Design a protein around this nucleic acid. Structure first.
Length: 73
RNA sequence: GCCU
């Protein structure tokens, strides 16, 4: 998957642990980006609604998606 | 695994 942007900050809109995905609102563009549980760095791979996260934006098979999702430090 |  092609990297489109790196070191992007965003706010978690919601993340559903039953379905394994959610959306992050990018702080730089105000657009939502899909996030799958497997894209979150070390339950073990989850983020919380309302938290600020840092991530890359990549081109998945269905459009842009988050990758390498971590805390901002 | 694209609005729960």
């Amino acid at each position: 998957k092609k990297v489109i942007a790196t070191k992007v900050l965003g706010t978690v809109k919601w993340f559903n642990v039953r379905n394994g995905y959610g959306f992050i609102n990018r702080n730089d563009t105000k657009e939502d980006v899909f996030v799958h549980q497997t894209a979150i760095k070390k339950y073990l791979r989850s983020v919380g609604d309302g938290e600020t996260v840092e991530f890359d934006v990549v081109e998945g098979e269905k459009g842009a998606e988050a990758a390498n999702v971590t805390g901002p430090g």
